[PDB]
Every structure is written in C-alpha cells, then in structure tokens.
Amino acid sequence: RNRIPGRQWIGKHRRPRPVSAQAKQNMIRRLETEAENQYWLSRPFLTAEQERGHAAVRRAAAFQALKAAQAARFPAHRRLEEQLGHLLVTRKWS
Amino acid sequence: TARGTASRFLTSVLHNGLGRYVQQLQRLSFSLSRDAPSSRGAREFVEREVTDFARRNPGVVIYVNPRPCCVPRVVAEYLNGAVREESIHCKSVEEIAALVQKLADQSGLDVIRIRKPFHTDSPSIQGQWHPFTNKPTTLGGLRPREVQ
Amino acid sequence: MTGKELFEMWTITNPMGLLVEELKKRKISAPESRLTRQSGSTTALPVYFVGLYCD
Amino acid sequence: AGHQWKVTAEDLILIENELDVACGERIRLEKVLLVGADNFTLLGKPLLGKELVRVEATVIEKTESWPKINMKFQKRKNYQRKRITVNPQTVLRINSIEIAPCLC
Amino acid sequence: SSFSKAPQQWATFARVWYLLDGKMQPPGKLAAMASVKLQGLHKPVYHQLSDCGDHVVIMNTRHIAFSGNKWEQKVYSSHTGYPGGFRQVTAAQLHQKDPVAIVKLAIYGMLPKNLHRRTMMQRLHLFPDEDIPEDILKNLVEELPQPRKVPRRLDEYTQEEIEAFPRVWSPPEDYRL
RNA sequence: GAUUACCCCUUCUACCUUUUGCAUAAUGGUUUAACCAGAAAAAAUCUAACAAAGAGAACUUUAGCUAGAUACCCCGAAACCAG
RNA sequence: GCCUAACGAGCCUGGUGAUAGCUGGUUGUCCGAGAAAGAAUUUUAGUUCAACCUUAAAAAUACCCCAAAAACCCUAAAUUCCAAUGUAUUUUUAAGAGAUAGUCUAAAAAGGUACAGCUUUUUAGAAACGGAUACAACCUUGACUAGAGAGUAAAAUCUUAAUACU
RNA sequence: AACAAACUCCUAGCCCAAUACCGGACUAAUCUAUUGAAACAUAGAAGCAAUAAUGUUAAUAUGAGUAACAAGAAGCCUUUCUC
RNA sequence: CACAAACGCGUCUCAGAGAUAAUUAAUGAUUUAAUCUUAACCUAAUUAACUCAUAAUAAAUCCAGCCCUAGAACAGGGCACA
C-alpha cells in the first residue's frame, strides 16, 4: 500500500533504510584500527637516505634468478627407454 | 544421491576388533590371459607380488586362473558372504597392488551412504535426558493448583 | 552379549515377586510402590514414574 | 583427526581420512578433553595429562567412502561440471578407557 | 539410567502440561514462552521432525495487560473475502468481544509458519478466568514464572514499608491540600 | 538435506535461446524412437629425413628443402530468368 | 477485375544447394588461461584496422615510484615524469580469433524541468551459493574436493513527536 | 555478547569459479591393420556421439470417452396406420 | 393465460440494543483564578459504519419400485388411512 517508486535502491526516490547501532559500532571499530595503523606508520627506523641502495644487491640477484629460470626453457631430452619401452605392450607368457 | 540410494548405520561384522581382529577378506580370485595385452599388468602382479602378498596375509586363499579372457577380473569374497567384483583390466603392477590392498582391508559391508560416523550401544552412561530429569520435586507431590 | 539387556535374554514374567524374594535374601523387607512423577492422567498418552522404597 | 568425539568402550568411529596403520593395530588416542563417569567428571585445560587417562582404540577397517556427486551449474551459460568424489575412510573401534589414580 | 528400551524412549519424548498465569501480563511476553514450549524448543532432544511439543495452559487471559496506548492503537484486521468485507478492529474492541483472542493471535503469530503451526496450536488451551475443566487441571506438571513483575498499587504496601520510605520534602503548614 | 518413518520440517524463482538485464506474463519444445549441422594446408607451428643443399624431372634454397599432422557448419525468403 | 479455391501478375519443371550483414539451430568428458569498444566505412543490425586478449618463442627490465622538473591573469581533486624500495612482471618475435548494439553505483561536467530506471563524455567500481525481507549494478568476500570441527565479515525495529500565561 | 559467509584456520587430499574466442588432456560407438578370442590392445581411419532448428518420418498421449453424429408407430413382419 | 402452472402490470412483509468521529458541556489539578482533560476520577450530549441480541438451519445410517408444487445428473419430500 506504500510502494517504493521504480526500483528499490536506485533512483531519485529510494527506500529510506536507516543506520543501525550495529553499523556505527562496526564503522567505529574499523576507524580505531586505522588510527592505530597510522600511528605505527609514523616513525620509520631508517631515514630516507639511510635506506638508499641498502639492499640493491639482493634485488639485482633476484632478477638474475628470474631471468635464469626462463633461459633454461628448452624441449626435454628424449631417451631410448621410451620409444623402445613401448614394445613392452605385447609382452607374453609362453 | 542420498534420497536416491540405500543407506546403513555404521557397523562391524561380528563385533570385529572388540575381542580380537579378524581380517574379513576370505578369498581372492584372479582370472587373466597369458597372451592378451589387456592382462599385462595382472600377469606381472602374479609373477612378483602375489607370492609375497600370500605370506603377508595367511588367512586369504588366492586362486589364480590363466584362461582365454579379454578382461582380467579380481573377485574378492568376504566372511560376510559379500562378493565384490573388480576389473584389473589394463592397469600397472602398482595400481593392481594398491587395489588388492583396498580389498584386503575392507569389511565386506556394502558401500553406501553411512547415516552417522559413530556407533554406540549404551551412549547414555549416567542417564538419558527426559522432561523430568531437571525439574524439582515438590512437597506432597502436588500439581500446580492442587490443594490437600 | 554387547548392547543387550538382562531381561532381554532372561524373560522372567513377574519382576515384583522375584524382587521380593531377592530382598528376603538380602534381609531387606518391603518394597513400597510410591508414585513419583506424572504427566497427564486424563490423556491418551500419560507418563508415570513409579519409585520403589525400602524403609 | 580434527574433530571431537564422545567416546566409550566397545564403540565405533568413522574417520574421514586415511591413517597409516595396519588393520588391527592398537593406538593410544592422546588428546583427551573430557573424562567422565556416573559420579564424577574430569575436565581438561584444555587437555588431560597423559598420566591421568589413557584411551586405546583399534583400527578395524580401512575403506573408501561411497561416491559423492558434486555438480556445478549455471543458467544459460552452457556450463555444467560433474565430478564424483570418493574419500578414503578409516573405522576405529575404541577399546578401552583406563583412568589412573594420580590426581592432585 | 537402566530402563527397558520402550519405557526409556517413552519417558524421553513424553508430553508435559505447563500452566501459565496471564493476569497483568503483556500478551507478547506471554506468547514468547508459550511459543517456545509449544514447539518443544525447551527440550535438549528437540528436532523439527520429532513431534515434541508440550501442552500450554494459559489462564486469566481476560486480565491481560498492554504497555503504552496499545489498547487504542493496535488494530487487528481481517477480510471475509466478500467485496466490502474488510474489517479493522481496535484491540480494545476485539478483547471486549472475545477474551481469548488477543493472546491467541499473538501466539499464532510467533509460531513458525509451516504446517506444524496448526497442530501445535491444538496443544494450546486458553481460559479467560480461572475455571478449568478438572480433566485439564489433573495433567498440569508445573507452573511457569510470570514474565513481568507486577507493581503493587499504593494500598498494597504495609505501613511498615510506608514509614520506612523517607519524607523527601517538608510542606509548609499554611498550605492547604 | 534427511529421517525409525511416504508425506509433514528445512533450503532452492524449469531448461534453451536472446539480451544491458529474463522465474519472467520474451523465444522454442506433449512425449518416445530413428534420422538431423565445421569442409580446404599460402604463411605458420609440431614431428621426422637428408642437409649447403633437398625433392622419384619441371621447382625452392644467404639452413634450407622434402614429407607427415594440425582449418574454416545446418535449415529458411519475397524474388529474378528460360522453357 | 478475371485467367482451375493465394493474380500489383498463373502454374509447373529447370537455372537451384538462388542469395540473405536478418531469425532460428549446431551433438562426449574433464582441465588451463579469458575478453565492454579508439579509427574509418551508403557506416553505425556489418566489416577491417588499433588497444586488450590467447598459444608458443626470445629477451630485459617492468610496474610501484622521494626530491628536482612541466605558462603566460585567477584557478580544485589531481596528472605527467622519475631514483630508491617492495615485488615478478614487462617488451619484442611468430601465430590467432572473438569483440567493437552496456547496465547501474560514486565523482567532475554538459543537455533537459538544478525531471526521469533520461541522454552525452571523463575517473573509479561492481555484476555471491553471505547481507540489504524479496533484489544485477549497494555492502562483506584472493570463488578447489571431503569433515556430523573452529574463528571471523557485512549485517536485523529510525528518532523525535514540544507552544498555559491570570 | 552471541548468532551469522566461496573469507581464515583445522584433519586429509586428486591443492582453487566463469560467457565469446583460444590452448590442453582424455574418451563412447563403428570400420581397417596386426594382436586378441566371455569382447580386447597398439595403430590407422571416418556418414565419429543431440534435452532444444513452429526440425523430418513413424508411433503414441492430452484436450476426451468431450464436440459431433442416427432409425415416424404398431403388428400377424411386410400389413396397416401417422405425416 | 387453450396443462392443473409459471408470470407482472398484481399481492404481502421489512426491526431492537450497544458502539463511536467531529463538536458541545459538568467536576478539576500542573498554573490553589480559570480551563471539556494526548491530567486523573466519575461523567453527560452526541453521524455512519461495525459488532450483537434475535431469527434461520439443527432427528447419523429403511429406501427396490412408483409419485411430486423436489430436481440437469446425483440428491430431497411423499407412498397406513381415503
């Protein structure tokens, strides 16, 4: 008897839905975690210049491994045991 | 599906494992072809493994028949009377071995849905709840509006 | 015999009498049947709990 | 095996995964939360000392689960998948619950 | 613990008759516990496919109380199905007409909406005052505690309790009451 | 899903097609059986032969040549022309 | 109008398997990745190029990116560009198609009535088997299999209803 | 607080959803070559798999024992009556 | 009106009590005057609805046939006078 015009949640006229004490709690708890979050982000150990190149040795190494892993891709070895081993299909008792 | 098929409660045959454990698998019958390739694995299994298997399980009698068949089968048969058929057709030695083991360690009960994971006779030690168990008794044992 | 009762396999037909005899043997006297709990007497499905008392 | 059970002598449990034991082996189930008897009960925090209680179970039967169908479907996307699952199972008979007098 | 099988099973699933006094209670708080006991949700053995549910006898239904202005504002509506058969009736009017109605409707609204509602509605017995067939009296196991504590009027208090509570202010002798 | 138990309880808005979006009150089908719809090797890749050459003639070649294997549907107009 | 029950031009056979950018249909199982539109076009019911994407193959840097740096009157959210650092991606080569008829939500604007579940661009997002009773697009959530375990997420009735002035 | 998910732990694993297009691994049934000989194997081939085309043909239901259909009368049986 | 009927153009009958809305009053506090009062207590005067008195229905199982002011069928009323 009291219709919501058009589609429920979309248009110029929407279903009114209210904010719940639950929702306020949840949102606030998130906020608290974030405030703490940006407390711990506030004081670095090293300064900006103290970390320059501080590990550049590891980073280059990693990339050398990444490269090396790809360079190794080649068709696999083929062995006699395969092509010959196929004959085992017809093996018998006699 | 579960409404589709039959079902059973969890049980043992003859209360196995209570007094002592009895391996339920009774006999094992292989049928294979000396010639046919389909039976290849089954032949190798008979060569190497069967012998050792027979020592590892003294209580099961193993009948091996070479015959002209296209589809090697193994027929497990249990103390329960239960007969379970299998096809070893076109498998490794390894596969067959694993299969024969499954057969060795099964109860012979039918494989269907099992209604619940536990089976207890006398679950109830120290009582079984009834509507009165937690209710206080009154003086004279009168009902709510009863007068004396 | 696992899971089975006593009176499942014993089949004795008059429990009261047998009880009285066994209590004579134990030198205890007179079990008195005393009604303990009940729900609905007027129902087609009543439930009674009868207790037995000795002294 | 990741679950809790209410166990008593002579009984049966069905574990939903493989155990490495021969059929017939006796096994001490170690973690014990609760022990109980008609007149008393011991509670763990959250476990009972191995000296306080010992429950031994036999493995009766190694087996596999009945086939369980699993079917994904989507309306007018032409997508079905049907997969049959069979799970390895292990049936334990629990044998004895013994309880040692040492308690303080 | 040792019972034969049949009597054990019978004792466990046994029906029970609760008596619930209604005088000065909100039909809602009444219907809450009534609903629980009808569905047999107070039994640890509960399941939806077991018939378990117990009889509930509510009495003094006429003396039901309604918090706020609900007696005026709460309207029970129904429709005969015939054109112009739509009937709205204020709770005061409904109660005036049929003593049992209010509490019955509330309970019927709080049961689950399946077919079992119709069955477990048959285990509910409602009496406007305290007059109960002795048949129905003889089954009553126990009486549920009333869900609202009823405040006493001023004339209910003992003079001890009246002199025990402090005079808060001191009225002028000149002032007339 | 289950369940001692057929129902009763609980959970799920047929399927194709078409669409931004279909339980749709958009399309198609009473049902059963039998029939009823992806086809080609230029370049490519993969496997192999022989290799500054390869192909059982004719060609191609600054690692190529030769061979093999990998590929591209079904039903439907109103019409038009000749006899 | 009529010319053998349909004549804006008969019927039958052949041309004929006419031709349809248009509709319909298109048959075993399981696994790996996986796509919303810039350009032309008698073109917007379609094609062919880009950008993405797929299958192989070669490589080397790829995103992320602090200062420094990019306009003349006023001018925001912010871009561009780049070391470090966190990661494993990106670029070429060889083969390929599909797709190119788009929805809502938030944001900046335009048109309209500071109308539309309206229309036109730009940035972002989504298209749960959980929640918002029902629900495409809102919110929670790195979609495997079996358990008769466990912890969590989003989430369920919104407040007020007040005016004495001798 | 609790209760509440494809999230996350837990015990095991065969260890992570999908439309158009794309890649892969398997395979039903036929035939041929050799095996095989209570119904198969390794290859090679194909008219190689139908819950959807107002699909074709046959057969069956539903609507439905429904709509609709018919013979003037008696008698001694071909004689009288009535139209 | 050419069936014994059906029929109108003809004939007969048709209602009590309680409840309210708007709006009027009486008593009377917060605010010792006043004031109908989303102040109490009793209160009066007051539309239509709407409920309800009251009316109607109300004997479980003979039923072949045959009749009917009963009826599509099925049901239903008659069938001892005479």
Ligand SMILES: Nc1nc2c(ncn2[C@@H]2O[C@H](COP(=O)(O)O)[C@@H](O)[C@H]2O)c(=O)[nH]1
């Ligand atoms: N052009 C285009 N169409 C898409 C894409 N993804 C989905 N679609 C279309 O969306 C429809 C259905 O979407 P879905 O069933 O995948 O949710 C189909 O018409 C399908 O072709 C895309 O990335 N590009």
Ligand SMILES: [Mg+2]
């Ligand atoms: Mg709407």
Ligand SMILES: [Mg+2]
């Ligand atoms: Mg709207």
Ligand SMILES: [Mg+2]
């Ligand atoms: Mg449309």
Ligand SMILES: [Mg+2]
């Ligand atoms: Mg599309």
Ligand SMILES: [Mg+2]
């Ligand atoms: Mg929908």
Ligand SMILES: [Mg+2]
């Ligand atoms: Mg519609």
Ligand SMILES: [Mg+2]
């Ligand atoms: Mg319909």
Ligand SMILES: [Mg+2]
């Ligand atoms: Mg539609």
Ligand SMILES: [Mg+2]
């Ligand atoms: Mg239509």
Ligand SMILES: [Mg+2]
């Ligand atoms: Mg339809």
Ligand SMILES: [Mg+2]
């Ligand atoms: Mg259409």
Ligand SMILES: [Mg+2]
């Ligand atoms: Mg269709």
Ligand SMILES: [Mg+2]
């Ligand atoms: Mg149709």
Ligand SMILES: [Mg+2]
């Ligand atoms: Mg070529």
Ligand SMILES: [Mg+2]
């Ligand atoms: Mg292709």
